[PDB]
Amino acid sequence: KETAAAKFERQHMDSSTSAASSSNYCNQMMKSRNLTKDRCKPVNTFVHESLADVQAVCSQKNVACKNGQTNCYQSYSTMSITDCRETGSSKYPNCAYKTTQANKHIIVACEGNPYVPVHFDASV
Numbered sequence: 649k650e651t652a653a654a655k656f657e658r659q660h661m662d663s664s665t666s667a668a669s670s671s672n673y674c675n676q677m678m679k680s681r682n683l684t685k686d687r688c689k690p691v692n693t694f695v696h697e698s699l700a701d702v703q704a705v706c707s708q709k710n711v712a713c714k715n716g717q718t719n720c721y722q723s724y725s726t727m728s729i730t731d732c733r734e735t736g737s738s739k740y741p742n743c744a745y746k747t748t749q750a751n752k753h754i755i756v757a758c759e760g761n762p763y764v765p766v767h768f769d770a771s772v
């Protein structure tokens with residue numbers, strides 16, 4: 649099946665853009681990444697950084713996860729991120745999102761060999 653590490657890249661990585669360009673960003677990216685296929689995923693963050701800069705977070709500030717796990721890491725640097733959150737007009741299969749572009753530090757959980765991000769925890 650897809651790896652936890654490949655699922656994080658499909659859900660979270662957008663190295664192909666620097667920032668969301670239009671209020672449509674989340675609607676197009678949630679659908680094309682397959683995030684709306686069984687239900688509307690309600691919150692999802694996109695990171696507009698190279699894959700190497702985000703895998704590097706796994707060697708940065710170790711912090712507790714929101715759930716208490718201690719395999720979380722916070723980026724030293726802020727990153728370009730897009731927060732996509734479902735709107736009150738959102739109704740399955742026509743999921744709809746509000747797009748918010750920001751520069752925030754990211755908190756990811758890491759696992760494995762090589763030790764890479766497998767979960768997006770929070771932007772701060």
Ligand SMILES: Nc1nc2c(ncn2[C@H]2C[C@H](O)[C@@H](COP(=O)(O)O)O2)c(=O)[nH]1
Pocket residue numbers: 691692693694714768769770771
């Ligand atoms: N699982 C997951 N949680 C996310 C993602 N992006 C943001 N969140 C989290 C971080 C915040 O704890 C929370 C949302 O509500 P708020 O309290 O209003 O910002 O959801 C994501 O991509 N995946």
